Design a protein around this ligand. Structure first.
Ligand SMILES: Nc1ccccc1-c1cccc(O)c1O
Ligand SMILES: Nc1ccccc1-c1cccc(O)c1O
Ligand SMILES: OO[C@]12CC=CC=C1c1ccccc1N2
Ligand code: FES
Ligand code: FES
Ligand code: FES
Ligand SMILES: [Fe+3]
Ligand SMILES: [Fe+3]
Ligand SMILES: [Mg+2]
Lengths: 383, 383, 383
């Protein structure tokens, strides 16, 4: 639907994924943090190419499509919430219910036959771990848990994060994240030196192709992901060589991190432990449009008591956010951006030359092609 | 010619109008005020996607296409008017007559076989009511009166206004203008308060459909337009309700305005009376390109003599311009801009959901579709 | 390939030239000066649409395509030259030899089957007269002399130059350069006045179409060019008329310049003498992309010894660069830019109306169409 049929034919083994330029419909996605949206103060945003309005009403979140049924203007241009339960289009005063999208009133024509007989599209919203998730799909939504990595929703897991808009397609973000050899870019990181991480330059793989990854299609709440097991049989590269001469060494720190690395639909990486042995990193690459994503970073630490919680809050702000979420991950941002040109025309998917450590990436592409819950197209974006 | 055939065959009610992205060829359009162009001071502008040069020579206006026949440069990059009767291309000095566009000389080669054997496109130009009209069309022009709203050319009707370039397709401007229910956007206008206007929110129509409008396809000078009769038999709305509760009230002033609204080919709106009961508004939405229009506003007031004309002028500069043409219509500007996205891919025309107040707009689309004097295409712009 | 057949079929005689939007493959092009590329300090540039990296290693220049075979990033985003012989991609550390482009190492997996089995595209590079030439082509290069104008490579010819990026297609630049009537744009030039150059407004051509130019294909190094001979038997215009009336005069002067004007593949103009009787100007219009070129300007002066070289350089910096290469040729830059719109949709090639002195340009279009060594296409750029 999205990509020239010529290219799609050439990537048969994961063509649904190459097509999913705008992301995967019928999944939950994080778009902002709970505390960024107050009572009665609506926010606009674009998710999988659709402009959305989110409002907090009696503590509860609601999401309407930010496009009037009449002449297709964004309501956010001028928000007129004249009652608690409604929003009034600034243009001809079509008035919709936040709860169900129902065109309940037209102030400029009380007697109109459209009234009660049209519905602005709505999307479920759920708040969890101080994160706002929207189900960008059709019908009654599945549990949040299906579209979140293992442990994100654990009772004791405290979640702190950061969100920004990055100018690359979401998939370039995903693949960079789940790429075992890309850790080469992080070799001069501030986190690596100052927090004494053990970090190889990469891995010389071992075993058959089936031992590189473990596909998880078999989760009890219905998660779909791929674990990267290149470390299992692989030999870490700590002395990098050219013509058999050593020209670069990995970092020989004492702290062991990134034991498990996994990628889950709809596109969320989990690295454990990271950036410290007492934490995990959960990060989403959410489609905004074909060129843009929210980089939705979260750090998780199990906490029992408030003093634990408040201590973590403080470590997050003084160490982890600036030294890890920025320090470390800023290189991931540049790397994503640097792939834009080669994949901009959709030709990159066929002219790329992969090598052994990309097995993980390929397993993700296959996984994503088979278990996605729909492909967002221009038809979803338009009408 | 301009819009995907797939889109056109799904707007069979008014397909030529949806195709008329660059506007309609073979009509007169206003592009500036007489006073804005002095003797021997050529001005460049773009009309229906064509770059034009206008000049005033011995008080009379002339118009040439601003594109040399030779290497297609705009003459206006460096205007060389070396005799009153001619313009000389800065590049290789092909020299053309203003009056007929004939290539009469070439300074770089006076023996060229091209001399007297080529002609640069000219367009008729005529001034009326201190407005400059160009006949962007072919062959002999009709009277100007055909393409102007009734009373605009009355001998006592004094015209003053303002012109600006607005980034929306000309049709978005037109429909907004002739939209009985968009009046809602003006409810907190300073004009409405300080000039004490009887402006409602909107209307509940009365009776037949054919009855909401009056099509004028039968005007003696060949005018073609639609009058809005929504509230000849239709009840106007002053108290806007949601779930029975009044949430908004219209305008409570003593002056009755906008008793007759009409839209005329090629795209000019008459609002009578407005913004005061002794005035009319005549405003054009002139296609510059696919994305842009001149918003050529005028106010007309009958004046007996130049004394009453001075008073009107004072009242215009001091009151009506800042309060009406800016204050009031500034809202019309950002409303047009708000429809751009939805209509940009030509998909807005199939995906819009209209209601009863838009009976007027649909009649216009059909009027325009039947009675236009031609569709401007890229073929006219280029070749 | 690059241009629609609807157009190419209407320019028989020079359709390959019209197709050569990105320029001609399998020629040498100047891109920068020797002084600008230092030992161990690579630079990126785009030539014929392709991003390239140039390095100086043991004084010798090398050129690699600036696009990793792996995920198609530019290496130049973050240059890692870890030995004198190699460059290492910053992303996953694929390591390429400069000399032959072979993938000789990968620091992230030194056991990859990819090693020794892949080759990054290289191009030959060669320096002459302080200028850096890249052979943007396949296989083994011809001598550089084929792609330089005559006398440029002469033992005694001191070359001093200037280079900048200009926003027009390269062909618009060439055509303006070699256009015998374009001199009209130089009539108010400070160089013409202050150096008292004899400069007609143009030439009334002298007799036979077949003899306004001389094609050269027999040259000892296989150079391919056209000489403009309009001035051989042409009558100069010093008194330009409109309706018999003298409206502009040419520039009388002692100094006879530009009696020898030639254009050469791949796109280099020689004007001799210029801007003084004992100098000449060689200038290239080097395609960067469809919209953009390097305007690579040089002045040549036979210098017998160092006193001559040093006083030439004094003259260049104080006089010839600001008055000639900047003052005079600034008008050529605007002339090129003014033709962009007409040729941008490829329709200018069919809609242009030529006159007698354009014979020179047509001779060049046919020469170029006959003797170029390949058309650069999008598939050379991408894959
Ligand atoms: N993928 C990783 C492998 C080893 C160590 C750290 C990471 C990692 C963690 C968070 C974000 C990233 O982009 C990473 O590469
Ligand atoms: N082509 C020329 C003809 C007469 C005088 C000067 C020139 C000339 C020399 C160098 C660069 C240019 O653009 C010129 O027009
Ligand atoms: O949008 O504004 C106009 C156009 C310009 C001035 C005043 C207008 C007006 C008044 C009453 C009904 C519809 C209307 N359209
Ligand atoms: S555009 Fe929202 S009511 Fe008309
Ligand atoms: S472009 Fe106008 S005379 Fe050549
Ligand atoms: S993109 Fe260069 S080594 Fe991977
Ligand atoms: Fe990373
Ligand atoms: Fe020139
Ligand atoms: Mg002189």
């Amino acid at each position: 639907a999205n990509v020239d049929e010529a290219i799609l034919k050439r990537v048969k083994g994961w063509a649904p994924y190459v097509d999913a330029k705008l992301g995967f419909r019928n999944h939950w996605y994080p778009v902002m943090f709970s505390k960024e949206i107050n009572e009665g103060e609506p926010k606009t945003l674009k998710l999988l190419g659709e402009n959305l309005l989110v409002n907090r009403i009696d503590g509860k979140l609601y999401c309407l499509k930010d496009r009037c049924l009449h002449r297709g203007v964004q309501l956010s241009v001028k928000v007129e919430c004249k009652t608690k339960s409604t929003i009034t289009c600034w243009y001809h005063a079509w008035t919709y219910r936040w709860e169900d999208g129902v065109l309940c009133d037209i102030l400029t024509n009380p007697t109109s036959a459209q009234i009660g007989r049209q519905k602005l599209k709505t999307y479920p919203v759920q708040e969890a771990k101080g994160c706002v998730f929207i189900y960008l799909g059709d019908g009654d939504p599945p549990p949040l848990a299906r579209d979140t990595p293992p442990n994100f929703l654990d009772d004791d897991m405290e979640i702190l994060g950061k969100n920004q808009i990055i100018k690359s397609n979401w998939r370039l973000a995903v693949e960079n994240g789940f790429d075992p050899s890309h850790i080469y870019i992080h070799k001069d990181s501030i986190l690596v030196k100052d927090n004494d991480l053990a970090l190889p330059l990469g891995f010389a793989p071992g075993g058959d192709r089936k031992q590189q990854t473990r596909v998880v299609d078999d989760d009890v709440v219905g998660r779909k992901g791929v674990y990267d097991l290149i470390g299992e049989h692989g030999v870490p590269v700590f002395e990098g060589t050219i013509g058999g001469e050593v020209v670069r060494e990995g970092a020989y720190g004492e702290k062991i991190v990134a034991n498990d690395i996994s990628i889950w639909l709809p596109g969320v990486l989990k690295v454990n432990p990271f950036p410290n042995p007492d934490m995990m990193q959960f990060e989403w690459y959410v489609p905004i449009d074909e060129n843009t994503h929210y980089y939705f970073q979260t750090l998780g630490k199990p906490c029992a008591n408030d003093e634990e919680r408040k201590k973590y809050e403080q470590e997050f702000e003084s160490k982890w956010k600036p030294m890890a979420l920025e320090g470390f991950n800023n290189d991931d941002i540049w790397a994503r951006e640097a792939m834009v040109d080669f994949y901009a025309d959709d030709k990159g998917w066929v002219n790329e030359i992969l090598f052994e450590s990309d097995e993980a990436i390929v397993a993700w592409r296959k996984l994503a092609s088979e278990h996605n819950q729909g492909i967002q197209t221009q038809a979803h974006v338009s009408g």
